[PDB]
């Protein structure tokens, strides 16, 4: 298996771990803050997914410092993981185009 495909699969597994850990740590950080809505794990996981994908509907958002720091990690992990997937697709296309050119 080539590196870029192994790295993509590794990034996908790492992203799932960030989503699960991010959902657990957000609830742990948001409870205790009056008005916080990111205080139950099922919707916290939904919030983490729409954060890593950078969709950000606005139905859920962190208000505490550590809840927002968790959000930052989720954002970077999601942007990086999907970016590595795009990078792997580019390598696949470039490698196929080299063979298409004989070189």
């Amino acid at each position: 298996s080539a590196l870029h495909w192994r790295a993509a699969g590794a990034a996908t597994v790492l992203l799932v771990i960030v989503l699960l850990a991010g959902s657990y740590l957000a609830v742990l950080a948001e409870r205790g803050a009056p008005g916080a809505q990111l205080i139950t794990y099922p919707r916290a996981l939904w919030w983490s997914v729409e954060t890593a994908t950078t969709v950000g509907y606005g139905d859920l958002a962190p208000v505490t410092l550590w809840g927002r720091l968790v959000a930052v990690v989720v954002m970077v992990a999601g942007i990086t993981s999907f970016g590595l997937v795009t990078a792997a697709l580019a390598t696949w296309f470039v490698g196929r185009e080299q063979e298409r050119r004989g070189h």
Partner: antibody
Amino acid sequence: QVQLQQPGAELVKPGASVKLSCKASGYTFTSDWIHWVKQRPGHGLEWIGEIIPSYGRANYNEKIQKKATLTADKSSSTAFMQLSSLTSEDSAVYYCARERGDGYFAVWGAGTTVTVSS
Amino acid sequence: DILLTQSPAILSVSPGERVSFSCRASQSIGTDIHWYQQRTNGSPRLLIKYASESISGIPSRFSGSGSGTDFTLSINSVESEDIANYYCQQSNRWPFTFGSGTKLEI
């Protein structure tokens, strides 16, 4: 089997302190929160605080006077609420409840009738 | 914090008649309301979770409705075992808050 086990009663002198217990059994997950609810005779339910035993962080109701300290012991699966400087206004029934991190209190304890008297 | 008003405090119903309990929230909480039953000298018992979801072991006559700020706990054909206090509790915003409670008498 009963999931949350609390003592029957505790007699506390005015100003003295007491520590209540709540032995947990059944399924226990890392997403468990133990809550404490206060109910005076002739009153509704009053949320006191919460604690996650898999991490040890405790939150408290900021509307009321803070007279509690929530601890947890994972080796014996027992949460503790330490009440300090008790007056007659603190005499109530104190329940413990287990929340699976999804909002509601699925199971309650029998409650410990705390009577502050001389 | 979120305020949960239950009015009226006492509901008088003849046997075998439907009875509805009211729980109004100071602000919208979607469907994050939960109902409990407490008989005399008893511990609270979960009846309905998330406004309208059933609980295993709870009789079929118990149901719930509503979303937003107004929530209803309905008991089809009230019986003597249903004589207790009924509380609502919200889980949308921290901290969790309870309602004042509504007593059912027959």
